[PDB]
Amino acid sequence: PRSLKKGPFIDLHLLKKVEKAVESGDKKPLRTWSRRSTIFPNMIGLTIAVHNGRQHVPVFVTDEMVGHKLGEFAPTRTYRGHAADKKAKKK
Amino acid sequence: MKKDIHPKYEEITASCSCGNVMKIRSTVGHDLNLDVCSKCHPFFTGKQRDVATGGRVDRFNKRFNIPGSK
Amino acid sequence: ARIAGINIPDHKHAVIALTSIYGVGKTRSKAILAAAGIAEDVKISELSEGQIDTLRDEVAKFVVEGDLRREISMSIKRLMDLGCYRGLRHRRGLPVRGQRTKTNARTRKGPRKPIKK
Amino acid sequence: MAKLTKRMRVIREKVDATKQYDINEAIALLKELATAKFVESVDVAVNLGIDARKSDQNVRGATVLPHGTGRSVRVAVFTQGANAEAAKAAGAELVGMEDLADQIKKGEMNFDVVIASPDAMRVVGQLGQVLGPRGLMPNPKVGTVTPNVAEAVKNAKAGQVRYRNDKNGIIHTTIGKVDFDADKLKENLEALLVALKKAKPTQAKGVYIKKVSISTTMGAGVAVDQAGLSASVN
RNA sequence: AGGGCUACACACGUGCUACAAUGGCGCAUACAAAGAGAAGCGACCUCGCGAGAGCAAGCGGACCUCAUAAAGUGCGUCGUAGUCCGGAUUGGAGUCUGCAACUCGACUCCAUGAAGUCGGAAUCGCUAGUAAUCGUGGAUCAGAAUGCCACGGUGAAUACGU
RNA sequence: CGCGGGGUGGAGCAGCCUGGUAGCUCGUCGGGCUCAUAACCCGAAGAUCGUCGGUUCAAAUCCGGCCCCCGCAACCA
RNA sequence: UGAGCCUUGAUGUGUAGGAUAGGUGGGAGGCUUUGAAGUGUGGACGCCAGUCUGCAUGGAGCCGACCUUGAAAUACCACC
């Protein structure tokens, strides 16, 4: 297994996004480039739009996803299935 | 009523007013107020950064580096 | 005296023989024998049943297989209803620990396959 | 198999000519053509004109002879549960289950006949169809398969003989020793002939006895014109 | 700044190691060459199952260290059952380089435990320190070698004939 | 009346007799080869072997029953 | 020369088995020069030299009950 080693991360980018977001409880989805960032208690009930490189994809932040990174809910690679080859695109 | 085909009565006909004496009478939360994940929710419970045990030696509060030293 | 029966290699020395009551690969077995006062280079045929009891009691604390195979079952399934990437790679069957998918999918996703064209 | 050896060559010299014989002169000749140090046994080959297809159209069973043969007839009792003494007092050697289930499985039996209970026979002895020439298993068709085992021991030691077909209408059956007189022998003969005749089908009103040939054991054989209906030498 | 070629329905080129017992298991046991270590590595140290941790004499490398070189040997042990070969996967915990290890990073290690019994079509180097086979170090080098380069262990059949 | 032969992957065949072992030509689908085209090589899938039951470690085969197709039987007159 | 009827005579080279497996009853062996076997002579007799074997001489053997392999077991006489 892999880990986060030993130091403390809160991410600089989510600290400053979250501080302005919490004050209303919630507002419209926060435009996020931070795919490096873990999910945290401070972020519970926010809606984080996560750039995947092509576009932002909405991740709804909630208690069950705190063991995880923002970049896990938001996808990257495309899988061609083998019922039959993928004919179409998905955005 | 066909009595005999119904299972034994030890805890049936006895004591419909019973305690929690070996087992509870009612569970909480099974009517699902949040949808069930079957997960323990990590870094919510618990810690994002690992335990420090092993390599227990007196801390140096002023900057130090093992290859930066000769 | 068979530890547990079903698969033990017969007239085999004691260290490999115990990998069939489960929860005890070689390392834990080594320490379990040391406790009971048993040497490694004995064969497992030489022992009275009361040593077999002293062994079984020291195994019986470690993880039961019934729980071990449940632990991997519940670990993929949890991830898999969540939609984290860990859980998505388990969904397709592909490797999760960095292995190729253009090659070396076989141990998880099964034999090589016909492709219509 | 019938390999060409010494013990037949001497007998084959001592014969005068091979031809089909009147039964009383077949028996007097056959007694001359024993050779062995052991007392030879006498049995009869009778060709039956029945169809000989499975059972309906077969002749199957046993009879008790009025005079017994000079052989012992090695009877075993294959059962799961009997009082041993009661079966031994009838004349049996061995009563049990494990030893007789073991033989009929392995495919070799020390014993010539086994008497079986229905509960022994069912698992081992009942299926076997290509059973060889040593005849190990119990059979229903013979009538040796009975729960009245102690009865079957007492009629086996006193004189009970069997008849059965192969793939053909031929019945070979024990008639006695070469030790015996001609009268006693014709008397054994006629008792068998009457039992196969009682068991004969209704379609067997044509030609029934086709050929008769009489045999002795280690020693050679003598062809017969027919068996006749008589219990006497004259 | 994030994402990718490291994708997956697969085929193919190559190399690795294996499919045993010539070996592997346990315990005991042996000797390398060559080179790297000035920004760096490093005995003893105390902690740690190990990895690693935090301290540090010392070094200039024929002094100290990477590094226990492995294969091979000793003894006792194993029979085709994918095992007593082979050990991949995966769960889980400890550790690491870096704001940051999710798809796409490294290491230790616990438990369970598959494919594969020499493989169709295809398919290559070799004349002897070679071929085969076993391990090592280094170049590169944030973090990662099956590869490349060289080194030493152990070291083959035969070359009639055109 | 009676005798005797046959019932195979989607299509036509082989194997058969004390047996196991699905084999040949097609149609199908995937791969390989040659500098390339070319012919050619290689694998796979496909069956209750007419259907039922029995013996045996083994049945398409041997054994018992049933439905179907055909030659002869010169027969329905 | 078919068919019927009939006198005697044999090979059986199995997956597993030392070799000798048509179905199967009698039935536990033939000691007769050891039943042998054996160079040698002939004979039955075949998945081609293999199973069995007559005999001057030969006390040296098929091969079971047993010992052993198999679904079935084996001698030797019969029956076909």
Swiss-Prot record, chain A:
Q: Name one GO cellular component term.
A: cytosol
Q: Which domain of life is it from?
A: Bacteria
- GO molecular function ontology, one term from the record: structural constituent of ribosome
**Which keywords does this chain's UniProt record carry?**
Ribonucleoprotein, Ribosomal protein, RNA-binding, rRNA-binding, tRNA-binding
Q: What's the effect of swapping H82Y?
A: In MW145; suppresses a rimM deletion
Q: What does this protein do?
A: In the E.coli 70S ribosome in the initiation state it has been modeled to contact the 23S rRNA of the 50S subunit forming part of bridge B1a; this bridge is broken in the model with bound EF-G. The 23S rRNA contact site in bridge B1a is modeled to differ in different ribosomal states, contacting alternately S13 or S19. In the 3.5 angstroms resolved ribosome structures the contacts between L5, S13 and S19 bridge B1b are different, confirming the dynamic nature of this interaction. Bridge B1a is not visible in the crystallized ribosomes due to 23S rRNA disorder.
**PANTHER family, A to Z:** RIBOSOMAL PROTEIN S19P FAMILY MEMBER, SMALL RIBOSOMAL SUBUNIT PROTEIN US19M
Q: Which family does it belong to?
A: Belongs to the universal ribosomal protein uS19 family.
What protein is this chain from? Small ribosomal subunit protein uS19
Q: Which organism is it from?
A: Escherichia coli (strain K12)
UniProtKB/Swiss-Prot annotation, chain B:
Query: MF terms per GO, please?
Result: rRNA binding; structural constituent of ribosome; zinc ion binding
The effect of C16S is: No Zn(2+) binding
Q: Which residues bind Zn(2+)?
A: C16
Tell me how the cofactor is bound. Binds 1 zinc ion per subunit. Only 1 ligand appears to be Cys, the other are thought to be His and either backbone amides or solvent.
Q: How does it assemble?
A: Part of the 50S ribosomal subunit.
Entries under HAMAP family matching the protein: Ribosomal_bL31_1 (MF_00501)
Q: What is this protein called?
A: Large ribosomal subunit protein bL31
The gene designation is: rpmE
From Swiss-Prot, chain C:
Q: What is the effect of changing N104K?
A: In PW097; partially suppresses a rimM deletion
| Protein species of origin | Escherichia coli (strain K12)
**Where in the chain are disulfide-linked cysteines found?**
none
Tell me which UniProt keywords the record has, alphabetically: Ribonucleoprotein, Ribosomal protein, RNA-binding, rRNA-binding, tRNA-binding
Q: Keyword Ribonucleoprotein on this protein?
A: yes
**Mind telling me which InterPro entries this protein's record contains?**
Rbsml_uS13_C, Ribosomal_uS13, Ribosomal_uS13-like_H2TH, Ribosomal_uS13_bac-type, Ribosomal_uS13_CS
Q: Which GO terms describe its biological process?
A: cytoplasmic translation
Assembly, per entry: Part of the 30S ribosomal subunit. Forms a loose heterodimer with protein S19. Cross-links to the P site tRNA and weakly to the A site tRNA. Forms two bridges to the 50S subunit in the 70S ribosome, contacting the 16S rRNA and proteins S19 and L5.
> Per its UniProt record, what PROSITE patterns does this chain match?
RIBOSOMAL_S13_1, RIBOSOMAL_S13_2
Which GO MF term does the entry hold, naming one?
A: rRNA binding
Chain spans, region Disordered: 93-117
> What GO CC annotations are associated with the protein?
cytoplasm; cytosol; cytosolic small ribosomal subunit; small ribosomal subunit
Q: Mutating N104H leads to what result?
A: In PW095; partially suppresses a rimM deletion
Q: Report if keyword RNA-binding is assigned.
A: yes
What name goes with this protein?
Answer: Small ribosomal subunit protein uS13
Family label: Belongs to the universal ribosomal protein uS13 family.
Curated annotation (Swiss-Prot), chain D:
Q: Return the Pfam families for the record.
A: Ribosomal_L1
Keywords, in A-Z order: Repressor, Ribonucleoprotein, Ribosomal protein, RNA-binding, rRNA-binding, Translation regulation, tRNA-binding
Check the record and name the SUPFAM superfamilies matching this protein. Ribosomal protein L1 (SSF56808)
**Residues with PTM N6-succinyllysine:** K105, K154, K186, K197
| Any one GO BP annotation for this protein | negative regulation of translational initiation
**Record keyword Ribosomal protein present:** yes
Q: What GO cellular component term, any one, is given?
A: cytosolic large ribosomal subunit
The organism sits in which domain of life? Bacteria
Check the record and name the CDD domains matching this protein: Ribosomal_L1 (cd00403)
Against InterPro entries, the record matches this protein to: Ribosom_uL1_bac-type, Ribosomal_uL1, Ribosomal_uL1-like, Ribosomal_uL1/biogenesis, Ribosomal_uL1_3-a/b-sand, Ribosomal_uL1_CS
Q: Which GO terms describe its molecular function?
A: rRNA binding; structural constituent of ribosome; tRNA binding
Check the record and name the NCBIfam families matching this protein: rplA_bact (TIGR01169)
Quaternary structure note: Part of the 50S ribosomal subunit. Cross-links to the P and E site tRNAs.
Q: What does this protein do?
A: One of the primary rRNA binding proteins, it binds very close to the 3'-end of the 23S rRNA. Forms part of the L1 stalk. It is often not seen in high-resolution crystal structures, but can be seen in cryo_EM and 3D reconstruction models. These indicate that the distal end of the stalk moves by approximately 20 angstroms. This stalk movement is thought to be coupled to movement of deacylated tRNA into and out of the E site, and thus to participate in tRNA translocation. Contacts the P and E site tRNAs.
Provide the family line: Belongs to the universal ribosomal protein uL1 family.
User: What name goes with this protein?
Assistant: Large ribosomal subunit protein uL1
Species the sequence originates in: Escherichia coli (strain K12)
